[PDB]
Design a protein around this ligand. Structure first.
Ligand SMILES: Nc1ncnc2c1ncn2[C@@H]1O[C@H](COP(=O)(O)OP(=O)(O)OP(O)(O)=S)[C@@H](O)[C@H]1O
Ligand SMILES: Nc1ncnc2c1ncn2[C@@H]1O[C@H](COP(=O)(O)OP(=O)(O)OP(O)(O)=S)[C@@H](O)[C@H]1O
Ligand SMILES: Nc1ncnc2c1ncn2[C@@H]1O[C@H](COP(=O)(O)OP(=O)(O)OP(O)(O)=S)[C@@H](O)[C@H]1O
Ligand SMILES: [Mg+2]
Ligand SMILES: [Mg+2]
Ligand SMILES: [Mg+2]
Lengths: 258, 316, 441, 322, 258
C-alpha cells in the first residue's frame, strides 16, 4: 500500500530465467518501467554485444506501475536475490517513488510463509542506443536447443564461428588450428512437431563471422524460448532473438573484421 | 560495562573538537555547503582526525549517514577484491541526496592499505566523484600512493597545545566530578605531549586507582622516572652529584634505560631555566645516547656519558 | 557541485596544457594506424610510429595522459573500450574478455552511424603499472596483445622504467609526457579563477604549481579549496583570504619554514612566547616536508641570531652538520616501522636546531624542496644507465660504466659519414642507440 | 624434567615474586568488576607471562581454554588473523559461563604496525564486552593508538628481596647449598632477571655436585656465567693505571684470555669500580666516561678486539693525568 | 574377543552422522560405554560445540564391556567411511586400550570382507561441558527447509538474525547489496506431517549469529529430515538433529548486540 510500481510475476521462475538469460555478458542494466510494461537495453562490457529486453504487461498476474520509473540494477546482486524464491512463490516487484532500492516479495499460496528482499538500485548512465527495425538480408529460425549444441560444439574448435546463408541453406563453420568444424542444416517443417522445424527467408546471401565467446553467451537465452530467431545482414550486427509470451530477449552482436 | 571516557566524551559534532581551529572551521564550512573534495587528513596520534571526519560526515548527511557513508578501517578487509567490488559498488550505488551532498567513503588507517589496493581504488573515485567522495585518515600520508594523493586535498593536523588539552580536560572533570590538583593536571598535559586520547586515558586510570588526580598519583600510573628527579639530575651543579641521582634514584630503582633518556629529553625541552642554545645542545646529546640505547647498547655506562657530556656543555 | 577537475576537464586536445609535442606524436600514430596496418606495420614512417600496433603513454600523476588518450580517440571518431586497475585484468579474464575485441567492431558503432571509425575500437588499457597480485600474468598477456592486436591499443602508466613493465619494452610506441610547463598551468589556472569569480597573486598561483610539482589535477583541487572553504567571497576578502588559505590549506609547508626561520622566535623574548616545545611542535605540523624545507633554504637567510663575531658561513656549517646528522637518524627511523619514538630527536636535528643557527631575516624567498624532483632525475636516469649496462656487460660494474662510458660518447656523437661504421660496430640497434643517447645527453 | 627456568614457574599469583604492586591492583580490579585492558611491560624474566597465565587461571579456573584466547609471536597474527580469529572471539558470546572474554597477546611488540593498528580498532569496537591483555618488553615498540587503549603495569627487575627469596625455595626442594656472598654474586649478575638466576643455579647442581652436599662459592658463579671478579677486574685497573703500557697491555691480555672474559665485561665492572674513586679534576670523569662509552659502543658493532682493548688502556690512562 | 564390538544396522548410517562434524569440527575423541557412544568438541574459535549421542537402539549388536576413548580425525575417518557399499554392514572393533580402531564392512550373500585400519588421534583433551537445559523458545522444521533459508540469506550478510516473535519464526539478514527476510509460521499439513512446522514460544527471543557457522550447521541435515532449534537470549542456541537412538546437536554462541 506504498508504491509507484507493483508487478506480480505469474511464475517466479520466469523473471529468473529472463535475467539468467543475459547476466553473464552485462553487469549494470536500467529497467525502464511504464504503463504497458518493462523495457531494458544494455551494452556489453567489451562493447560488442547489445542486449535488449521487453516485458509486456501480459506476464504479470497483476501489473500496476503508476508513473514511469527507472530501475538501474546490478544483475549479479539481483540474481542472488531471485535465487531465493522457491517453486510455489509469487514474486512481486515493488518500487516506491524515486527509489533508492526495490522490494521483491516472495509470497506463497499458504499465507503462512512470506519472504521479502530489498535491493539497492544502481546509478547507471546508460548510453541509450537507437535500435531501429532493419531489413536484414536473411532471416532464419530454429530450435534454441539446437543452436545451442551447434554453438557449443564449434566453439571447441575456433575462437570464431562463421555463419553462411547461401542458396537457402544454413551453414556454420569453425576453422581452428586443431582442425575445422562444419555444420549445415536445410529448412523444413514437421507438422508432427512444428517447434522442431527449421525456417529460412533469404533475400540475399550473407557471410559473417562472430566471436565464439559472444555466441556461447547468447545461447544462454535458450531457456526462454524453444526457438531462436536470427536475422543477418552484411552491414549490421546480427540479431538473435528469443520469444516470450509477452515480450522478448534480443541480442545484437557486432561481427568481426573481413 | 566500563565506558572509556575517550569514547564516552568523543566529540559528536565538529563543534566539540578542540582541534586545529583554522582547519576545523574549514570543515565547518564544507558541512554547511557540501562540495567536500576527496581529502587525506594526516597527523600524529590522537589529535582528532577520525573524530573529525565522522563529524563532518554527519553534519553533511544527517539522517543519511546510515546509507551514504561507508567506513572501512584496519579491522576490515580492504584488499584488491573489496576495493574492486564493495567500494566500487558503493560509489555506483543510487542514493538521492540534497543538491550539494555526496555519499562518503571513509578509509581510516589508510596507511595500512596495500599499494595494489590503493592502485585499484584510483579509477573508482575518479569516475564516481559526482555522487561519492573519499576521506582518508592516517598518520603517514607518505604511505598513500601519489595517484590517490593528486585526487584529493591534503589536510595536516597539528598536536594539541597544552591550553587545548587543558580545556577538554576540565570539561570532562566537571561532568565526572573528578577531584583534581593543578599540578596533577600539569602532569597529564606534560605526559600526553599533544595527544588528547592519551591524556584522557591516563586521567581516568589515575582516578580509577587513586580517585584524586594529583601529580604524585598521576606519575604513579604512568610509572616513569618522576620529572622532578630527572630534572634535579640534569641541573646538579656537580657531575658527581647527578651521577649519584642516576645511580640511586633512577638505575637502582629499576627504570628502563629508554625510560630515563625519554624523560630526560622531555624535561630538558621544558627547562625554561636554561637557554635555548643550551637545551638544544643537550637534547642533541640525550638523543645521541637514546639512539645508542636503541641500537642495543643500553648500558648504565651510556647514561653516565650522557650526563658527563651534558656537564661539559653546561660548564663551557 | 561537481569537483573542479571534472567540470574543467579538457574537451578537445585543444585544452591539454602541455606535452603538445607528445599529444601530436600520439594523435598522428592513431591516424596512420589504418595504413600502418595496410602495410603490415613494417614501415616505420618519418616518425617511427608505423611499426607499432599499440602506444604506451607514461608520466607523473595528473598531467593529462588519461585525458589525451581518451580525447585523441574521440577525435578520430573511434569508439572507446577501456579498462584500468579497478578491473580484473588477469591473464585468464584478459583472454576471456578483451582478447575477443582485438579483432571485433563496436556494436555501438552501428547505432551511431559520416564517421569513418565509429565502428572500430581503441582499447585503452589504463593504469597498467597498477596491475597487482589481482592480475596474475596480466602484463604478460597484455604485452602479447601489443603484438597481435588488429585495432589501436593505448596503454598508460606512471613508471615506464619499472621491472613489472619490462615485457612492454620493444613491443610498442612509447610516448613520454613530462611535467607540463608552468606558464601553461599558470595560464590555465588564471582562466579557471576568472570563471570562478576571484583573483590571485601570480606569486601565489606560481608557488602552487611549484608545490604541486606540476600535478595539474592537484592544483585544480587545491585551488577549489578557497571558494569551497569560505562562505561568501567579497571585493576585499580576495586579498586576505589568500593568507588563511595559503598559510593553512595551500602552502602550509611554507608557513612552517617561515616561522621556523624567523629569528624573532630565538631571541630571549620571543624565546619564551614561542617555546622550545612549540618550535619542535611546528615539525609535527608536516614532519614529511619540514626537514626537506629547512634543508632547502637554511642558507638563504640574513641571520640575526649569530653569536657576536660569528660569520654567516660558520653558523651555516654548523647547521649543515646537523642536517647531515638528522639524516642518519631518518634512515634508521625508516628502517623499522617501529622507531617513530625517534622523531622528536629528528625534529631537533633536522629542523629546529639548524634553524636556530641561521634564523632571522628572509633574504631571498621560501622555495619548495628541490630534493624531490631532483630525486626523480637521479633515479629515472639510474634506470637508463642500468639498461645500458645490461647491453654492454658483454663488452665494469654499472658504476664503472658511467665513469668510463665517456670515451664512447665521442665514437657515437662525434660528427652528428662514418655513421653506420661505429654504430653497428658496437652491436647496438635502434633503441640501443635512442636509449644510450638520452643518458649521454 | 623441565629445566629449572621452567620448573619453578609461578603456578598461581601468590607465587610471583617482586611484582606485588601489580598483583594487588590487578586482583582488586577483578574483585571490583573494573578490570581494564592491560599492558604488562618489562625486561626478560620478570614474571609477565607467569602473571596473566595465573591471573587467567584464577579468574576462569578450568573454563580457561574455552573462555580465554591466547596468541604469541609463535602464532600468526597478521591483519587477517586480527579481523578474523581475534575479532570473532571478541564479538561472540561465551558458550559456557556468563561474563567477559579474555584475549592474551603475548610479546605483542613482535606484531607489525599494520596488525597493531587493526588490533586496536578491534579492541575499540568490542571494549564493552571483552578484555585484552597485551604483553611486551618495550612499550615504545607499540603503536600509540594501541597503548593509549590500556592501563599499564611495568614489571620492574626483581629486587634483591624477591630473588633472595626464590633462591631460598630452590635450595630446599633441591639438595643445594649456596655460600653467603655467592648468592649475592648470582644476584648482582642477573640484573633482576629471575630467568638467569635459575639457569646458573642448575649449571652448578650438575657441576660441583659430588658429595651431593658441596658449597657453591663466588668463583663457581663468576666462572659459570663467564663474568669478571672484583679481584681480577679491580686488578686489571691497577696494571693500567700504574704499570707501563707493555706490562698493563699484558695484564689485560692475560686476565681476559685466561678467564674467557671480554672487554665489554671488564669495561662495565671498571666503570663502577672507578665510579667510587675521588678523582681530582671533573674532566677526568668526563673524558673517562666519554671514551669508555665510545669504546663499548664500537664493540657492539665488531671493530678490532685488539685495538679496542688498547683503546681502553689508553682512555683510562690518558684521563688520569689529573 | 573384542572389548569394543559395534555393528551398525547399516553402514550408510555412521556415514550421514560424521558428515555433521566433518567440516566445522577438526578432531573428536569418541568415548564409548555400555549404552552407546558419545562425543563432543569445539571450534578453535570457541563459538560452536558439537555433541553426539549414539544409542544402542541403532545397532544390530553392541558390546563395549569396559568404556573406551577413541580419538580420531574426521577427514581420515570420513574417507574410510566412504569405502562402504550400500549392501555392507559396518562394525567398529577396538582392543584393550586402542592404538587404532577397526571398521569392518561385510555383505550377506557373497564373501567380501573389507577391513580398514585407522590410527587414533590423541590430543590430550576430553572436556565435555553442557549447562543449558531450558530455553525460552523451541521450534522445529525440515532440515532441508532450513538449510535453504540459511544459504539464501548467507548471500547478503555475514550475520543472520533468528528473531522469535509472537508465534512467528523470523530470519533476517542486512548487508551491502541489500536485505533479506524470511518469515515462516507454525503450520501442519495433515497429509504431510514431516513438512509441518511447530513452534512453542514463552518469552520473545532476539539473537544474531555468524552465517559462517550457521552454514556448517545445516550440513547435519544429512543426519535427519527435520531439525530442532531452541533459543534463549544471551545463551548459546541449540540446533538438534533427531536420530532413532541418538542425535547430533550444535551449540552456537551468538554475538553481543546493543
Ligand atoms: N581535538 C580533540 N578534541 C576533543 N577530543 C579529542 C580531540 N582529539 C582527540 N580527542 C579524543 O580522543 C579520542 C580519539 O581521537 P581520534 O579522533 O580517534 O584521534 P586520531 O587523530 O584519529 O588518532 P589515530 O587514529 O591514532 S591517528 C576521541 O574519541 C576523543 O574523545
Ligand atoms: N595536461 C593537462 N591539461 C589540462 N587539464 C589537465 C591536464 N592534466 C590534468 N588535467 C586535469 O586533471 C584531471 C585528471 O587528469 P588525467 O589526464 O585523468 O590524469 P593522469 O595523467 O591520467 O593521472 P593519473 O591517473 O594519476 S596517472 C582532468 O579531468 C583535468 O581537469
Ligand atoms: N616474578 C617472578 N616470580 C617467580 N618466578 C619468576 C618471576 N619472573 C620470572 N620467574 C621465572 O622465570 C621464568 C620465566 O618467567 P616469565 O613469566 O615467562 O617471564 P616474562 O616476563 O614473560 O619473560 P619474557 O617473555 O622474556 S619478556 C618462569 O618460568 C619462572 O620460573
Ligand atoms: Mg583515527
Ligand atoms: Mg589516469
Ligand atoms: Mg613472556
Amino acid at each position: 500500500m506504498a508504491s509507484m510500481l507493483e508487478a506480480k510475476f505469474e511464475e517466479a521462475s520466469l523473471f529468473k530465467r529472463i535475467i539468467d538469460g543475459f547476466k553473464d555478458c552485462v553487469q549494470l542494466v536500467n529497467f525502464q518501467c511504464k504503463e504497458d510494461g518493462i523495457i531494458a537495453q544494455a551494452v556489453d562490457d567489451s562493447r560488442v554485444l547489445l542486449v535488449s529486453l521487453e516485458i509486456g504487461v501480459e506476464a504479470f498476474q497483476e501489473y500496476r506501475c503508476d508513473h514511469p520509473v527507472t530501475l538501474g540494477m546490478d544483475l549479479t546482486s539481483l540474481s542472488k536475490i531471485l535465487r531465493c524464491g522457491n517453486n510455489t512463490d509469487t514474486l512481486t516487484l515493488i518500487a516506491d517513488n524515486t527509489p533508492d532500492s526495490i522490494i521483491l516479495l516472495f509470497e506463497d499460496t499458504k499465507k503462512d510463509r512470506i519472504a521479502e528482499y530489498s535491493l539497492k538500485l544502481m546509478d547507471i548512465d546508460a548510453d541509450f542506443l537507437k535500435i531501429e527495425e532493419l531489413q536484414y538480408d536473411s532471416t532464419l529460425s530454429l530450435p534454441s536447443s539446437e543452436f545451442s549444441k551447434i554453438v557449443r560444439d564449434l566453439s571447441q574448435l575456433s575462437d570464431s564461428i562463421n555463419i553462411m546463408i547461401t542458396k537457402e541453406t544454413i551453414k556454420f563453420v569453425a576453422d581452428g588450428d586443431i582442425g575445422s568444424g562444419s555444420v549445415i542444416i536445410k529448412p523444413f517443417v514437421d507438422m508432427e512437431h512444428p517447434e522442431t522445424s527449421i525456417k529460412l527467408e533469404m533475400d540475399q546471401p550473407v557471410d559473417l563471422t562472430f566471436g565464439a565467446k559472444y555466441l556461447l553467451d547468447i545461447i544462454k537465452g535458450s531457456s526462454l524460448s524453444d526457438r531462436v530467431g536470427i536475422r543477418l545482414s552484411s552491414e549490421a550486427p546480427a540479431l538473435f532473438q528469443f520469444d516470450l509470451k509477452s515480450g522478448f530477449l534480443q541480442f545484437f552482436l557486432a561481427p568481426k573484421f573481413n | 560495562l566500563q565506558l572509556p571516557w575517550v569514547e564516552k566524551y568523543r566529540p559528536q559534532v565538529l563543534s566539540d573538537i578542540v582541534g586545529n581551529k583554522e582547519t576545523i572551521d574549514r570543515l565547518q564550512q564544507i558541512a554547511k555547503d557540501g562540495n567536500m573534495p576527496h581529502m587525506i587528513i594526516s597527523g600524529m596520534p590522537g589529535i582528532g582526525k577520525t573524530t573529525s571526519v565522522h563529524c563532518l560526515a554527519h553534519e553533511l548527511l544527517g539522517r543519511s549517514y546510515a546509507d551514504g557513508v561507508l567506513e572501512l578501517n584496519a579491522s576490515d578487509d580492504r584488499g584488491i577484491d573489496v576495493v574492486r567490488n564493495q567500494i566500487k559498488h558503493f560509489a555506483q550505488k543510487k542514493l538521492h541526496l540534497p543538491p550539494g551532498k555526496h555519499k562518503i567513503v571513509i578509509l581510516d588507517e589508510a596507511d595500512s592499505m596495500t599499494a595494489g589496493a590503493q592502485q585499484a581504488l584510483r579509477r573508482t573515485m575518479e569516475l564516481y566523484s559526482n555522487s561519492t567522495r573519499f576521506a582518508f585518515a592516517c598518520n603517514q600520508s607518505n604511505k598513500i600512493i601519489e595517484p590517490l594523493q593528486s585526487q584529493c586535498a591534503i589536510l595536516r593536523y597539528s598536536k594539541l597545545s597544552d591550553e587545548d588539552v587543558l580545556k577538554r580536560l576540565l570539561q570532562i572533570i566537571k561532568l565526572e566530578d573528578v577531584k583534581y590538583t593543578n599540578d596533577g593536571l600539569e602532569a597529564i598535559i606534560f605526559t600526553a605531549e599533544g595527544d588528547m586520547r592519551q591524556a584522557i586515558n591516563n586521567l581516568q586510570s589515575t582516578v580509577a586507582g587513586h580517585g584524586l588526580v594529583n601529580a604524585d598519583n598521576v606519575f604513579k600510573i604512568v610509572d616513569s622516572p618522576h620529572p622532578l628527579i630527572v630534572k634535579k639530575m640534569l641541573l646538579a651543579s656537580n657531575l658527581e652529584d647527578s651521577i649519584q641521582i642516576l645511580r640511586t634514584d633512577l638505575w637502582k630503582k629499576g627504570y628502563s634505560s629508554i625510560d630515563i633518556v625519554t624523560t630526560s629529553f622531555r624535561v630538558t625541552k621544558n627547562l625554561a631555566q636554561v637557554k635555548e642554545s643550551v637545551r638544544l645542545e643537550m637534547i642533541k646529546e640525550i638523543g645521541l645516547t637514546h639512539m645508542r640505547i636503541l641500537e642495543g647498547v643500553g648500558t648504565y655506562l651510556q647514561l653516565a656519558s650522557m650526563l658527563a657530556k651534558i656537564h661539559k656543555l653546561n660548564n663551557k | 557541485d561537481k569537483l573542479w577537475t571534472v567540470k574543467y576537464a579538457p574537451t578537445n586536445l585543444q585544452q591539454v596544457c602541455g606535452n603538445k609535442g607528445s599529444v601530436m606524436k600520439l594523435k598522428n600514430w592513431l591516424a596512420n594506424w589504418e595504413n600502418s596496418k595496410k602495410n603490415s606495420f613494417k614501415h616505420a614512417g618519418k616518425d617511427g610510429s608505423g611499426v607499432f600496433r599499440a602506444a604506451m603513454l607514461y608520466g607523473p600523476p595528473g598531467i593529462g595522459k588519461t585525458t589525451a588518450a581518451h580525447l585523441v580517440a574521440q577525435e578520430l571518431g573511434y569508439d572507446i573500450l577501456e579498462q584500468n586497475a579497478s578491473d580484473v585484468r588477469s591473464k585468464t579474464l584478459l583472454n576471456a574478455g578483451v582478447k575477443n575485441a582485438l579483432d571485433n567492431m563496436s556494436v555501438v558503432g552501428y547505432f551511431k552511424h559520416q564517421n569513418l571509425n565509429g565502428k572500430h575500437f581503441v582499447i585503452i588499457m589504463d593504469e597498467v603499472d597498477g596491475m597487482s597480485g589481482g592480475d596474475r600474468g596480466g602484463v604478460g598477456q597484455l604485452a602479447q596483445f601489443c603484438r597481435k592486436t588488429s585495432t589501436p591499443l593505448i596503454l598508460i602508466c606512471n613508471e615506464r622504467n619499472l621491472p613489472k613493465m619490462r615485457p612492454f619494452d620493444r613491443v610498442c610506441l612509447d610516448i613520454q609526457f613530462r611535467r607540463p610547463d608552468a606558464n601553461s598551468i599558470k595560464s590555465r589556472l588564471m582562466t579557471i579563477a576568472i570563471r570562478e569569480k576571484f583573483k590571485l597573486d601570480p606569486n601565489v598561483i606560481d608557488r602552487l604549481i611549484q608545490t604541486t610539482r606540476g600535478d595539474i589535477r592537484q592544483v585544480i583541487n587545491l585551488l577549489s579549496t578557497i571558494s569551497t572553504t569560505t562562505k561568501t567571497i567579497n571585493h576585499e576578502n580576495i586579498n586576505e583570504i589568500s593568507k588563511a588559505w595559503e598559510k593553512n590549506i595551500a602552502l602550509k609547508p611554507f608557513d612552517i619554514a617561515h616561522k621556523m626561520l624567523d629569528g624573532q622566535i630565538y631571541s630571549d623574548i620571543g624565546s619564551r612566547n614561542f617555546t622550545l616545545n612549540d618550535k619542535i611542535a611546528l615539525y609535527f605540523d608536516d614532519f614529511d616536508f619540514t626537514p626537506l624545507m629547512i634543508q632547502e633554504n637554511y642558507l638563504s637567510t640574513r641571520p640575526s641570531v649569530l653569536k657576536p663575531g660569528q660569520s654567516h658561513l660558520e653558523a651555516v656549517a654548523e647547521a649543515a652538520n646537523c642536517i647531515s646528522l638528522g639524516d642518519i637518524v631518518e634512515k634508521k627511523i625508516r628502517s623499522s616501522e617501529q622507531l617513530w619514538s625517534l622523531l622528536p630527536l629528528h625534529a631537533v636535528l633536522s629542523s629546529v636546531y639548524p634553524a636556530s643557527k641561521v634564523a632571522g631575516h628572509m633574504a631571498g624567498r621560501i622555495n619548495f624542496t628541490a630534493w624531490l624532483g631532483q630525486n626523480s632525475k637521479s633515479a629515472k636516469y639510474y634506470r637508463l644507465l642500468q639498461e645500458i649496462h645490461y647491453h654492454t656487460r658483454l663488452g665494469x660494474x654499472x658504476x664503472x660504466x658511467x665513469x668510463x662510458x665517456x670515451x664512447x660518447x665521442x665514437x657515437x656523437x662525434x660528427x652528428x659519414x662514418x655513421x653506420x661504421x661505429x654504430x653497428x660496430x658496437x652491436x647496438x640497434x635502434x633503441x640501443x642507440x635512442x636509449x644510450x643517447x638520452x643518458x649521454x645527453x | 624434567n623441565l629445566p629449572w627456568v621452567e620448573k619453578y614457574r609461578p603456578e598461581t599469583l601468590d607465587e610471583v615474586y617482586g611484582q606485588n604492586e601489580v598483583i594487588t591492583t590487578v586482583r582488586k580490579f577483578v574483585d571490583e568488576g573494573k578490570l581494564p585492558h592491560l599492558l604488562f611491560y618489562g625486561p626478560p624474566g620478570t614474571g609477565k607471562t607467569s602473571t596473566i597465565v595465573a591471573l587467567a587461571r584464577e579468574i576462569y579456573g578450568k573454563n580457561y581454554s574455552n573462555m580465554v584466547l591466547e596468541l604469541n609471536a609463535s602464532d600468526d597474527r597478521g591483519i587477517d588473523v586480527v579481523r578474523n580469529q581475534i575479532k570473532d572471539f571478541a564479538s561472540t558470546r561465551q558458550i559456557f559461563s556468563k561474563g567477559f572474554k579474555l584475549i592474551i597477546l603475548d610479546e605483542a611488540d613482535a606484531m607489525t604496525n599494520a596488525a597493531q593498528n587493526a588490533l586496536r580498532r578491534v579492541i575499540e569496537r568490542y571494549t564493552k564486552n571483552t578484555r585484552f591483555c597485551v604483553l611486551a618488553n618495550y612499550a615504545h615498540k607499540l603503536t600509540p593508538a594501541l597503548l593509549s587503549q590500556c592501563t599499564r603495569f611495568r614489571f620492574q627487575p626483581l629486587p634483591q628481596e624477591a630473588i633472595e627469596r626464590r633462591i631460598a625455595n630452590v635450595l630446599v626442594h633441591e639438595k643445594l647449598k649456596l655460600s653467603p656472598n655467592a648468592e649475592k654474586a648470582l644476584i648482582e649478575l642477573s640484573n633482576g632477571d629471575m630467568r638467569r638466576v635459575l639457569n646458573v643455579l642448575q649449571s652448578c647442581k650438575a657441576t660441583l655436585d659430588n658429595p651431593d652436599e658441596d658449597e657453591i662459592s663466588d668463583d663457581v658463579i663468576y666462572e659459570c656465567c663467564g663474568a669478571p671478579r672484583p679481584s681480577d677486574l679491580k686488578a686489571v685497573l691497577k696494571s693500567i693505571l700504574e704499570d707501563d703500557w707493555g706490562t698493563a697491555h699484558y695484564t689485560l691480555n692475560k686476565v681476559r684470555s685466561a678467564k674467557g672474559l671480554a672487554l665489554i665485561d671488564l669495561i662495565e665492572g671498571i666503570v663502577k669500580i672507578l665510579e667510587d674513586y675521588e678523582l681530582q679534576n671533573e674532566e677526568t670523569r668526563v673524558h673517562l666516561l666519554t671514551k669508555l662509552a665510545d669504546i663499548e659502543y664500537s664493540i657492539s658493532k665488531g671493530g678490532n678486539d685488539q685495538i679496542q682493548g688498547s683503546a681502553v688502556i689508553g682512555a683510562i690512562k690518558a684521563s688520569f693525568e689529573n
